[PDB]
């Protein structure tokens, strides 16, 4: 049941719409599928993608891989793999996709879904719908957040951080018209405020009307001196922090008491790490986007976990069952694994060796998730 | 493959010799045996000891762990019990001994020995003589040790805190007429010390020309500030602590920056999370006492983890093989689950399932592990 | 004047209506009573009672008392060990009982009402109406709380901490329905909320028109942080903060600045010594359910306390005359000792010295204290 | 049993040596015993003692006691009153003679000694020689000592804190000259030294070849940041703490840190309450000086108390019979109450009811304690 081979296919594609925040753009998606095959058969899946940069070429990927990580894991079983304790003591982001993928493969291997191997007591989540939407125009960001709605989200999330504070204004009252009311709102400026100016637009937030479930990493996250004295003034919403940090930051965060709540992403060991000591803290913990949703597992098997992002991207055509999202629930399924099987006929018509120009990309998949 | 039975059987015998430290006697064991059944046919192993009190008989124990155990375990994976992150917020001492059994029978269930389980590069650590020899008399004292120091330990810990402290010294003075030159020594005073009381103390141990690898719970294990004074200014030995600390409480302990060494015992799911914990900080651990050496799997998969305890306890007749130590070495076995297998032999001949009183044990089981 | 005997009788019966809170529900009492006698022919009382598991039989309880706790015990006065200061340094709860008992003894062994020789001014303490109520049907809520308001209570605390917060809003709506205008209000989340989730749902209390005297235990009680947090924030309320800490727990709590308010329940001698503490401090100390209302006389004892809890239970009828509750005062009796004396008639009818089941149990106890 | 009447008898005689300590000193003593009588006949007597400044006429103590004191006391029981928690919130020193008497009082009543009723499991603590010397003379210094030793004291007290260090050195030369090789030595500074000068002369003892015991105020008892430098850095000898403080204040030298052990006098209810706190936190106590020995029964009850200090002074003459002190150790007898009761002779010869100057004190009662 021990690892064997490694397969790389890599893609970069447009996208269905401009996303990104107060700090970056991006129309295009780069993305490779990891995949860590073992000799019973049974193939573990994940993803390894960049976020400002194109990958290199499907060659460039594979040899720093099979020079990088690969002799840490050939010949072992993913499930000793997930449990190895390492102390602090890449060319390529490949801790994420790694992590997924061992843990795929070791929940298939036990035969069972991934939640289920990872302890939960239940299958479904909250999901709330994100925007990733600064980029969008007016006319972009009604049609989604009321698309939202139509299919029963209840919870919203906008970028804001606008240089003119009467841009996020204005988007929370577009919001406001698009959505049933009572809707559940966060806001995400992305570190675009320093902390006095985070409070006092808060402040006029909340004096026009808004009641927010959070505002998201509002300033410098090493400002742990500010985060503090949010946490300590905002007393009507909460104070959701942890982007751009690794395990050890977000250790270091906690240490820090510098968040009303801790928001991950899709590392699954250090997940489960950090969901660990935030329950024995009391800090709650909320899952982002995680590509194509696979983080669906550890949301629905940690207990202080409420919320998973969804950001509607055109990513489904890339694999042949996408996790389920109904009525503002997201579903982890009772396949085995993490339940994200790539479509071979999507390895065949979308991948792309060879590192493109931006203008050499095509037409953008299409995107059923959103009209 | 999940678990549908439960078995116990209860422990109580005589010691071959006086065990027992500045606190506490004793020269009995009550112990019982837990077994995990899964609809597989494998079987988990974990024992349940108290070891300030016996334990009620078999009947009573059985029942309480019906009432009050069982219905979170029945019908579940082994393997999917083991990852569970509860939320912080038993009439007797099951916690050890689930977790014991529970990894016993997931690494059975995936074909592993537990250590490669827990994600191990090694299998072996070295191990120490540890006496428990307070209440020992000093013909005994040398007996002990010189027969650990003959097969080849290395590293020897005594008891200490007598009321009159050159009893301490009398007993190094002691441990040193029977051991190489050049051996690692230790000493647990048990907490029969204030913290000043203890620096000079070691002040004296020192120029008395005995040299210390640690020393073990000196003071009361809530005065933290006594701790990181001896921390600060012991600048020849380590402070090793943690006894008597649940999990919380240790994870308070690393907090406090109060150990130098943290002492660990048998929780298997517990002890893989602050060691990752402790790994993350630079804090190195060492496993005490476990049932049978059951921990010597953990010892061995943390990376910081250097020492195991070993108190040629009379406990070998109740398992088919006991895990093996050669030259100061033990070793996690090539085997499925953590190698201990109950002997069925010994539950006929020592399984005691009326609570007795100590004038009806009889004759200690021998101890081949002692002359 | 010394001890001589113990006698151990076991209750195990049904209650008149489901108990709880956020976290736990029983419908069943399980209480022993714990009677030492002296030489002098005079008695102590305490009680023994487990909330999660019933009691063992008698039998078990009797046995493991004799080997636990009975050598400290016997051949000694009550007022010298209720004296004894321990360094730090049971298989039942026998704690609580043993104290009650040590001190009931005691005080009548001197001829006086326990609060008298607890150095008492005072013979009484506000009493508010505690439902306990997190599971009653809204018909069997207000029909406690109106019974509450119709015999002389102007305090009331209900359980909250509802998955849905819609259902503490209403309870609290509810309750407004059922008491005179200007009544005192407590909740009770029972660890529920999280630190920033507590302080809003505090805030959409207050906006919604609810004035609280004070909020118990809202979070994780290990969680100084977020308690501080809340200190600092809610300037129009008291966080009131103890539950299920020990004495060394309420002190480490003190410590950190916690609690506005320190909760206590019956353990006579370490609520006499935390309430020194306190008085020092300038902390504040409510009296939580005792057993048939025995910490009474601490209640009146203390300076620093104002309220005591009063919960309806159908217990009274386990013993003579229980401790008078007029008009919202619960009034410390002039009887020697506690003026707890068990009911002969009650010790025939209600003894169970054998565990049953839960069907088992018979109709409840009559419960006179409700209608 | 309640009080109905007082007694005040006023003392004032010369001393039979000089006392004193580098701050000051005295060659006479105003004492004046306070008798609290209960309705049982039963009487208690505490030791109204003035250091500084001499006691007012008889007529004045006892106006002041009525008008201040009295109206609390009357009326009462006092196993009542000494139990009594009052809030923080004399004209003359009445608060360790109350407190004195009326335990003395409340122990007869219960027909106990008082070290039995403050829960004690032992009867003797070791008891160290303290020659209050610093004015003594280098003849009169050895005379004192080599008593002492030969009577079989082990331990030795010496005031140190001259302008001439040498004069330090000289007397634990002289120290050592008259006492038995192996003795314990202490030294009291009495606040004589700024914290860092404390520390360089410590070295220089220590280098000088003389193993101290403790050091006992040697620095401003308020200068926490001194104390704690000292406690840290002095890793061969404790910093013994705590002189000129209140049950407040000792309560705060304890949150800073402040003492590696805590010394206390005579005040019972107080020392009982420091002690318990002592106990939780790990900090050794001594007592000091109390009048005729009356601590010894706080001494020998408080687990973390090991020394009582014994200073020669010619007073038994005052009482029936004095404490017994035998080898260096100090018995608490196995008489109702502290066992100590007036002489009537004594009562007679030795009143004296008005104030007079230090020249018409007359010759000094016989020390028989003393060659």
């Given at each position: ?41 049974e193939v573990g899946l994940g993803f390894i993608q960049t976020l400002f940069n194109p990958l290199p070429d499907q060659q460039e990927i594979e040899s720093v891989f099979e020079h990088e990580v690969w002799p ?299 009209p």
């Amino acid at each position: 049941l021990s690892l064997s081979h490694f397969r790389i296919t890599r893609f970069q594609f447009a996208r269905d719409r401009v996303i990104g925040d107060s700090q970056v753009r991006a129309d295009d998606v780069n993305v490779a599928a990891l995949e860590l095959v073992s000799e019973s058969g049974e193939v573990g899946l994940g993803f390894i993608q960049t976020l400002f940069n194109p990958l290199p070429d499907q060659q460039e990927i594979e040899s720093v891989f099979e020079h990088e990580v690969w002799p840490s894991l050939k010949g072992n079983r993913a499930i000793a793999l997930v449990h190895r304790v390492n102390r602090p003591r890449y060319s390529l982001p490949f801790h994420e996709a790694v992590q997924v993928a061992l843990w795929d493969l070791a929940a298939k291997e036990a035969g069972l879904p991934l939640h289920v191997l990872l302890g939960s007591r239940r299958n479904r989540v909250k999901a709330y719908a994100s925007g990733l939407d600064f980029h969008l125009d007016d006319d972009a960001f009604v049609s989604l957040f009321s698309h939202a709605a139509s299919i029963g989200y209840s919870a919203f999330k906008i970028k804001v951080g606008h240089r003119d504070f009467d841009r996020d204004l204005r988007r929370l009252e577009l919001l406001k018209t698009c959505v049933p009311a009572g809707s559940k709102v966060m806001i995400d400026p992305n570190e675009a405020w320093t902390s006095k100016e985070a409070l006092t637009k808060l402040v006029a937030i909340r004096e026009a009307g808004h009641d927010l479930l959070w505002v998201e990493d509002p300033i410098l996250r090493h400002d742990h001196d500010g985060l503090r004295t949010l946490r300590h003034a905002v007393t009507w919403t909460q104070i959701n922090s942890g982007e751009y940090l690794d395990l050890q930051g977000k250790r270091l965060l906690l240490e820090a008491h510098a968040a009303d709540i801790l928001n991950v992403h899709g590392q699954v060991t250090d997940v489960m790490r950090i969901g660990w000591l935030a329950a024995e803290l009391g800090i709650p913990i909320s899952i982002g986007n995680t590509f194509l949703e696979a983080g669906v597992h550890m949301a629905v098997a940690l207990p202080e976990v409420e919320w998973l992002e969804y950001s509607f991207q055109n990513f489904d055509h890339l694999v042949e069952q996408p996790i389920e999202i109904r009525d503002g629930y997201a579903y982890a399924p009772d396949r085995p694994g993490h339940g994200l099987v790539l479509s071979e006929k999507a390895r065949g018509e979308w991948s792309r060796p060879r590192r493109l120009a931006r203008s050499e990309l095509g037409a953008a998949p299409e995107n059923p998730r959103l009209p």
